[PDB]
Amino acid sequence: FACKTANGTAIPIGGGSANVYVNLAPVVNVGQNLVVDLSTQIFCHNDYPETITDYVTLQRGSAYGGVLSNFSGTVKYSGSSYPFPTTSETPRVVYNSRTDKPWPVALYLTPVSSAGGVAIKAGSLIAVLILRQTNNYNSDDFQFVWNIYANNDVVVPT
Amino acid sequence: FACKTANGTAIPIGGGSANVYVNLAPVVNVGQNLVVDLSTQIFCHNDYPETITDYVTLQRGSAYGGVLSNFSGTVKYSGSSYPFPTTSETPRVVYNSRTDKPWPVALYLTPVSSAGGVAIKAGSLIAVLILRQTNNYNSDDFQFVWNIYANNDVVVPT
Ligand SMILES: CC(=O)N[C@@H]1[C@@H](O)[C@H](O[C@@H]2O[C@H](CO)[C@@H](O[C@@H]3O[C@H](CO[C@H]4O[C@H](CO)[C@@H](O)[C@H](O)[C@@H]4O)[C@@H](O)[C@H](O[C@H]4O[C@H](CO)[C@@H](O)[C@H](O)[C@@H]4O)[C@@H]3O)[C@H](O)[C@H]2NC(C)=O)[C@@H](CO[C@@H]2O[C@@H](C)[C@@H](O)[C@@H](O)[C@@H]2O)O[C@H]1O
Ligand SMILES: CC(=O)N[C@@H]1[C@@H](O)[C@H](O[C@@H]2O[C@H](CO)[C@@H](O[C@@H]3O[C@H](CO[C@H]4O[C@H](CO)[C@@H](O)[C@H](O)[C@@H]4O)[C@@H](O)[C@H](O[C@H]4O[C@H](CO)[C@@H](O)[C@H](O)[C@@H]4O)[C@@H]3O)[C@H](O)[C@H]2NC(C)=O)[C@@H](CO)O[C@H]1O
Ligand code: NI
Ligand code: NI
């Protein structure tokens, strides 16, 4: 089991960490959501699907920086919605093919009423999402840690 | 502050996520209404009412599946109606007793004029409703995320 990003970086068998940059709507008002869909950027696969079934959760999602200070959020994982920052590890998604399959995570972020001006700075860390991978074969229990960075400033009109 | 569902589950203090399985009118003709009344399904309480006032909004409601594609409608929250899918967070409802009190959310849906046949597939996701809870006591700001599923097919006769 391993994963890769659309930009080209990889996290190998056994887990690790990577940095992912995301494009953000540059202007967001109270009542609107910024949608950060990581399923177009993070892809994983099972390396021995004939003999092993891989199980993949969103172990935790955390907010940083301007997302932590200026937004409230939800996360959608494989069709179900949860608070973001997260309160518990999600149910599992099965990975059962050598063909890359997206990691089905998307953030929905909405400004709090005190947000205004530059609420998320370009290049800043906005979130950490921890993918936990186990299987039905041995004791492997690995973390793939995705550090999510903004490409651009996000402004909340005042 | 925490919440529970009928014959069901709980989302504890600090928020979280749950699935709610709802029975739906099985036959809804064009021009008839499908009401999804969550006030019989979702109940909340204040855990320290002698000292704290809890405030609860419908921060967002979103449609999925056959409700998104085959119905149009509104959401009523505590006596007032609003567009559904929602465009703004609602006014607050006060919770001030340890006795379970309903969350006063209902969807009022009507088939689109081209709908016919199976318009809501049994077991499918129909809505996500985000309950936001704050108080007059500390900085708590917690999301209770309700993933709403149809227990049965809804047919629009032709
Ligand atoms: C006359 C007067 O008011 N005197 C003050 C005391 O009331 C006060 O004691 C507070 O009282 C509040 C109730 O109003 C209690 O708050 C609840 O705490 C629950 C958790 O308590 C446990 O965990 C704490 C750490 O998590 C720990 O410190 C405690 O000892 C307990 O083990 C919490 O679940 C609850 O919140 C839920 O419920 C409400 C109501 O529905 C929701 O609004 C919330 O969102 C959440 O769902 C609520 O917070 C305090 O436990 C109690 N503290 C103590 C030590 O007894 C004291 C202390 O004030 C606290 O300390 C000050 C410094 C400040 O930080 C306050 O915010 C704290 O409550 O002060 C007296 O003067
Ligand atoms: C009929 C039959 O197959 N009988 C079995 C043999 O299959 C079995 O041989 C093993 O088959 C398993 C697959 O089920 C292999 O498991 C993977 O091993 C690789 C690493 O393998 C390389 O490294 C091994 C030593 O480290 C070498 O022996 C081997 O030759 C290779 O060079 C792991 O990377 C895999 O795990 C990764 O992928 C899975 C799936 O995505 C994830 O779940 C993991 O978390 C991890 O990301 C598997 O562990 C194993 O290599 C095969 N062994 C050999 C020698 O070929 C044989 C051995 O016990 O037993 C017979 O009964
Ligand atoms: Ni591989
Ligand atoms: Ni209670």
Numbering used by the authors:
A (entry chain A), B (entry chain B): 1 to 158
Task: Quote the paper.
The FimH type-1 fimbrial adhesin allows pathogenic Escherichia coli to adhere to glycoproteins in the epithelial linings of human bladder and intestinal tract, by using multiple fimbriae simultaneously. Pauci- and high-mannose type N-glycans are natural FimH receptors on those glycoproteins. The lectin domain of the fimbrial adhesin FimH from E. coli recognizes with the highest affinity and in monovalent fashion oligomannose-3 and -5 N-glycans. Hereby, we describe the conversion from monovalent- to bivalent N-glycan binding to the FimH lectin domain, with two full N-glycan structures, namely α1,6-fucosylated oligomannose-3 (Man3Gn2F1) and oligomannose-6 (Man6Gn2).
To visualize the interaction between FimH and core-fucosylated oligomannose-3, we have performed cocrystallization and obtained a crystal structure at 1.4 Å resolution. The ligand Man3Gn2F1 interacts with FimH via its α1,3-arm, and the mannose binds in the monosaccharide-binding pocket (M) of FimH via the conserved ligand residues Phe1, Ile13, Asn46, Asp47, Tyr48, Ile52, Gln133, Asn135, Tyr137, and Asn140. In one FimH monomer, the larger Man3Gn2F1 ligand samples more space, by rotating around the GlcNAc 1–GlcNAc 2 glycosidic bond (torsion angle ψ), resulting in at least two alternate conformations. The preference of FimH is markedly selective for the α1,3-linked mannose branch of α1,6 core-fucosylated oligomannose-3, identical to what was found for oligomannose-3 without fucose. That is interesting, because the crystal structure of FimH in complex with Man3Gn2F1 confirmed previous data on Man3Gn2 binding, in that the chitobiose moiety (GlcNAc 2–GlcNAc 1) gets priority over Manα1,6Manβ1 (4′-3) for interactions with FimH in the monovalent binding mode in their competition for the same space.
